[PDB]
Amino acid sequence: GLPTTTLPGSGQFLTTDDRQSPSALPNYEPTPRIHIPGKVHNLLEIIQVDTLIPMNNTHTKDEVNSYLIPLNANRQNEQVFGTNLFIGDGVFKTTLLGEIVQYYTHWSGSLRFSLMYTGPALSSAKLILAYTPPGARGPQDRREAMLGTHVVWDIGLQSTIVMTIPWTSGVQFRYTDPDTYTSAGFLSCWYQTSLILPPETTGQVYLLSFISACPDFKLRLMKDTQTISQTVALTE
Amino acid sequence: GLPTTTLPGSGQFLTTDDRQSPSALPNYEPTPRIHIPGKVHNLLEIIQVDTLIPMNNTHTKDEVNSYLIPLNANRQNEQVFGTNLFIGDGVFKTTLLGEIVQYYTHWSGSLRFSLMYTGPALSSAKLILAYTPPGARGPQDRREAMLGTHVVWDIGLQSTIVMTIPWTSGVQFRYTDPDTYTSAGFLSCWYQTSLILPPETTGQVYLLSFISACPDFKLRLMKDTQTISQTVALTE
Amino acid sequence: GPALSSAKLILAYTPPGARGPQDRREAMLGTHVVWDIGLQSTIVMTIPWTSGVQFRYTD
Amino acid sequence: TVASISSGPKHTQKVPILTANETGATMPVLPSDSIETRTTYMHFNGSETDVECFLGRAACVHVTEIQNKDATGIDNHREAKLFNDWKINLSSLVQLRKKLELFTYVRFDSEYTILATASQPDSANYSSNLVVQAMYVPPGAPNPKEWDDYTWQSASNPSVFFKVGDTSRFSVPYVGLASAYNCFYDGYSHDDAETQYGITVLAHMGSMAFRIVNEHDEHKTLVKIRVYHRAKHVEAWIPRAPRALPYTSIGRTNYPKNTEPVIKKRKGDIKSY
Amino acid sequence: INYYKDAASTSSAGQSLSMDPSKFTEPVKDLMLKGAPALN
Amino acid sequence: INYYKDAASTSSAGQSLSMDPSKFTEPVKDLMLKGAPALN
Amino acid sequence: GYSDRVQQITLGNSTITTQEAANAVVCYAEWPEYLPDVDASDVNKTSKPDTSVCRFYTLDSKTWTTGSKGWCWKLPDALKDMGVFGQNMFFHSLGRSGYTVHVQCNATKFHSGCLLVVVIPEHQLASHEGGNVSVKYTFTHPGERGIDLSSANEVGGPVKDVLYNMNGTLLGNLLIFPHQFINLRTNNTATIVIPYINSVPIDSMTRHNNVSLMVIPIAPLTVPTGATPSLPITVTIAPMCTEFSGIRSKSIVPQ
């Protein structure tokens, strides 16, 4: 008989501990694995695939239309859309990125925001996208917007433009749930010159917008998502 | 199954024991360290920086004035100040040295007591500082004082004088909370000749006094400080 | 001044393009030296050549 | 190591005891610069004054309480202490607080011990055996609303289940967002005119929530939770002046008005012993 | 022997045995030698 | 040290440290180079 | 013939000479340096205006009189309006800087008085209200004016009690912070070099001040007979190794 002493914590059950256990089914042989395409190893692998952002959130019931950012022909100087960058809330929240970020407490890294244009091929347009780093207000006019991170996008044969929100930060991690100290800025978009439709054409054209994370990205300290809850256990 | 026996003490929680525990956050990656000037490793590093002693304790509410030891022009033979050396109490008690000593039960070592003179540059003075080792009473006149550890200080260009209270002791440790058997002596200061002010000048001049520990110093057996307490938990 | 006096002065050079400074705050933003009056009796300020054109007229 | 070397009479032009404190230095003067000494050794290393040792013992950081009782007809579990939480923080109880605030920035892993004891202040046939389930709820997680919400499923959130009377123990890595925790912060969360000032803005680390898993027996049972915290792997920068006045709030430096003189007045003269 | 995988789970650290008070006691720009005059 | 005979009884697995998003982010048949035109 | 006593600091297009110095302190024995990559987080290239921001700005002068309690300035606030330093400050999202602080006060060999000049990293002030009253923004951003510890309590402002350092600690222990004394009989200036001290590699210059400079009379000013009873104190400060990052629109701050 070897002398032992038990410490504080004996008998506790910590849902996060990782130890060995007896197998209830001694000697059982599991089914062989066969090959299946698509294996995922890290959630970091999947948040780099871009998905659509319901940017046009202004509706009243969920609709395919809140994915469409409208553009008006012949407007000059004006603003196309605006949003803050609380990736865990608001427009971002239902996107795959938003949806995964919510399983973690802290995030750090660059984001990739792209816009794909869908107007007739014989039209043309020049837009400016601007990222405003924390510390200033959402820009109120392009002059204000153009003094921060921006890209003049020229609509052409190449249909999409990929803007990166480079990680601009004092503190090396931000909270995924919106927090002030930790806030990330604003994203706005304005006409640089203006949309022009060809003859025989009319109305609004739309941009689709996507979001995905750069390879830069870090997420840490897992927790429970506000995105799902329940009141009684389900049954069959 | 290996046979064991549990000993007395099993299941106890000793706030001072040091063992391993499961991490609640398996696999989490802490923020990188960046460089910050000022790292402290031992409390022994900081108690060697000198800080001011409110020697002039005679006021009735805390004031900047109890840091000032006054000096009178033209007095001869007389006494400037006196104090016992219970570093955990009395004048010493609020100083950084006093304040740290109070986290430990026993101290041993030499102390460094210095006086910086602030009188007009065209004045002059000679003071005697005396350390009286345990066993005799606080000296009552310079004759008595001058027979123990002393330094004649000549006020000059060099503004401060550093007196050391060398460790004089039978027992190798003393208690920080005042105790008789364990007591350390007295410190007194007298005019050696006298302060003399230049013409066109008048009034009192003051000495500032500091205390810090020599590299000699030892503190041991940590405990709780009488210097802080509370009646209900604080809240935000 | 008497040896037992003391003083600290600021001398400022204002390069072409601005007006003669009107208060020290204005003055201190251009070439300047805080002079501390001491044992060393003189202070030598240099007006470094600040110029677009490499020569100026003496008149 | 020598604590003092042997030194004899001196009659020099080289005076180590005259200095100029105006410079900001504390010159390293020793007994042997001003009296005649004999050799002596240190016999000591300064082991127990290492900051790891100083901050490394468990301190009580929080006492809360929850009860097991019939929730039937309770409109606000949180309010009935059917479960309770704690807005994690280390500055609420002030013994450990004075120790940490001797430094400006501090970095360490935490080891928590949680002791839970039960009380049955009014007539019970017996003492029941309750299991507590303290669970960590980080910022931006579904806060729990009843004592038996879906929240308690805690499928992604670390939770520990232990018995009342026992102790639970586990250790959490340094979860700070920056490189160190700020013991002090002379800033705001943004440049608004009315936003709070301090660290409270900073050190919002989310809260911890406790509940009893047991349903109710016929009597009521009070369970009082004590959380202990031990720093391990400590790193501390920039020493500061110790706290002199009493504390009034978690996270602000504020002291109470008409406080009392903190320096003991002499019973006698400056000249007194 | 560590029984656990993560570093936070290990016991207390071991004595710095670093100790260098000069950043606090002598942060002066020009070095002061004990015994030489403070102000020259 | 495994104390048990069966593989199911061992602790959690250890980090893939595999990571290759291209099956998801670039499943295109003809390789696209960043910087070259998307459609030629 | 070099003395600890005479010194010259040239930084940018500005120079300071002191003929009565008492050495100089370099906080925590470290000299300001730029931000190394290994410590970097924000991916933005930073802007280093160099000589246009790293020069000496002299703040407006104070007047030490027998009743003075002490003054307090915060950095980078005190410089929020100095030349291009200030512009850069309001225009970038993040910035970082070290400083050389030179405090000046000359008198004669008949005066007495002694000021403590100290730099406190992260000086979080206390509300004089007690409890958990906060100290509003404006109050902790006095600008070049600094805070005058002998001014009256105001509402939403900090406490101005000197024996407590504006935070519940005793004046006597401020000596644990990099500091230097100005003792009329010895000294006429104090100089402290401040390296950048923070828990993040770069921060916001407007929502967080990282040091308070404090000048406090400790041995009261005593002038010779029939002298005017006061002396001016001047503070000149120079940003050093400044870097700004995350340029944009230009912050708007309360008041």
Ligand SMILES: Cc1cc(CCCCCOc2ccc(C3=NCCO3)cc2)on1
């Ligand atoms: C300074 C300072 C100190 C602190 C506290 C930091 C500790 C990190 C979060 O603490 C916990 C507490 C409990 C648990 C927990 N998980 C399962 C049960 O309890 C996890 C992290 O914040 N700033």
